[PDB]
């Protein structure tokens, strides 16, 4: 894509492509404000969601978050 997937870890602020891809790969993961902090750690700390190469691993890691009782009001 616009980022180096397999070349270098560094990507410009145009890394917004990640959010665009993930939201379409998984669907609406827009979560709860209670769980907002977990999403922010799982998006900003994890090499999955930072580095554009690991789009799939990020996507799954967010999905299981968005559907677990912290992001999901409904008890699964």
Curated annotation (Swiss-Prot):
The lineage of its organism: Eukaryota, Metazoa, Chordata, Craniata, Vertebrata. Cytokine that acts as a physiological ligand for receptor tyrosine kinases LTK and ALK, leading to their activation. Cytokine-binding is sufficient to activate LTK. In contrast, ALKAL2-driven activation of ALK is coupled with heparin-binding to ALK. Stimulation of ALK signaling is involved in neural development and regulation of energy expenditure. The chain holds residues 77 to 152 of 152 of the full protein. Widely expressed with highest levels in adrenal gland and modest levels in pancreas, testis and uterus. One of its GO terms (biological process) is cell surface receptor protein tyrosine kinase signaling pathway. Changing residue 24 to E: Slightly reduced affinity for receptor tyrosine kinase LTK. Keywords: Cell membrane, Cytokine, Disulfide bond, Membrane, Secreted, Signal. This is ALK and LTK ligand 2. GO terms for cellular component: extracellular region; extracellular space; plasma membrane. It comes from Homo sapiens. GO terms for molecular function: cytokine activity; receptor signaling protein tyrosine kinase activator activity; receptor tyrosine kinase binding; transmembrane receptor protein tyrosine kinase activator activity. Changing residue 21 to E: Slightly reduced affinity for receptor tyrosine kinase LTK. Changing residue 60 to E: Reduced affinity for receptor tyrosine kinases ALK and LTK. Disulfide bonds join 35-71, 49-58. Belongs to the ALKAL family. It is found in: Secreted; Cell membrane. Homodimer; interchain disulfide bond is not required for homodimerization.
């Amino acid at each position: 894509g616009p980022s180096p997937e397999q070349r270098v870890e560094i990507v410009p602020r145009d890394l917004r492509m990640k959010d665009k891809f993930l939201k379409h790969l998984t669907g609406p993961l827009y979560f709860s404000p209670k769980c907002s902090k977990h999403f922010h750690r799982l998006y900003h700390n994890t090499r999955d969601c930072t580095i554009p190469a690991y789009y799939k691993r990020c996507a799954r890691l967010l999905t299981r978050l968005a559907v677990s009782p912290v992001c999901m009001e409904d008890k699964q």
